[PDB]
Design a protein around this ligand. Sequence first.
Ligand SMILES: CC(=O)Nc1cccc(OCCCOc2ncnc3scc(-c4ccc(F)cc4)c23)c1
Ligand SMILES: [Zn+2]
Length: 316
Amino acid sequence: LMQFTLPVRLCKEIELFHFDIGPFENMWPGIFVYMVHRSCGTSCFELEKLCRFIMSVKKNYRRVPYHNWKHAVTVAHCMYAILQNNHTLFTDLERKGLLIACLCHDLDHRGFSNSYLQKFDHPLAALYSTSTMEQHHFSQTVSILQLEGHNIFSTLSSSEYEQVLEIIRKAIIATDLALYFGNRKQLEEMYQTGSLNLNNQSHRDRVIGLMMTACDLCSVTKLWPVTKLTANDIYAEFWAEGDEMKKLGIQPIPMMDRDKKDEVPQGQLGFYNAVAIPCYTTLTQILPPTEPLLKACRDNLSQWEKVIRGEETATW
Ligand SMILES: CC(=O)Nc1cccc(OCCCOc2ncnc3scc(-c4ccc(F)cc4)c23)c1
Ligand SMILES: [Zn+2]
């Protein structure tokens, strides 16, 4: 049988949460196939159909500084590290579904938030009033699955197929950060009152939603030099959206204003405190083997504090 392999440094480092997939774009499909085979087995997909699916997904990602193909594969790797560190918790269907959801979660992203679509009066905002881009990303995912030769789920019953596309739909909708706050608040209550039950489908959903936020934000869990350079890509998108807000005659929030770069360090502190730390804290309480994400997140907050106090500087 045909079992994908990696050079020794990659074969080992890929098991770690802080793995960087590197600058060689033509290696990323091989990295993804490798992760699926070790996460779900050589059986769970027809390799011809998989590679065809991957290459069409790649084609429907755009040339944007942050929400691109590299990000898709990076987010899938985080989900792979979480699945491999908790191999006993997830069904055969959830493992298959979640690596696909991660690869597809940002399909056809143009570097703009839901707010900008609503202020621009984009057509997708008429089709879907909430989680605008995220419902688009999912309907893109369904389209690629319905292309001739791309149905990587072709061997499932009508029943399992519907279950796997409901896992993918909810997984992709949960990457809407507006939904994250309430989702994590409810999980924190259910954990502390001891009512959280992984056998309750409704509880599993919320838990899978937190994992998707954790994987989506995973650039804050890398080593500082990777985190620091990804920050330049994130703000490159943010500043372009701020410029497009000014063209509609709207003053953008300061974090989207390229005239307020000075405020980024303090902005990153807010983000680590209000979003990142709480996210990996709750994920670690529910899934203890995910502690390294929280630890790497705390290390980077401590690096942004160093930047504020002038003992360290980011050029951007
Ligand atoms: C105090 C406070 O609440 N701050 C606060 C709250 C809410 C969002 C907020 O964004 C701060 C901008 C830095 O954003 C980021 N900063 C570092 N890493 C990453 S990885 C993904 C994002 C990312 C995050 C939000 C997106 F909409 C789009 C991508 C991101 C900051
Ligand atoms: Zn994403």
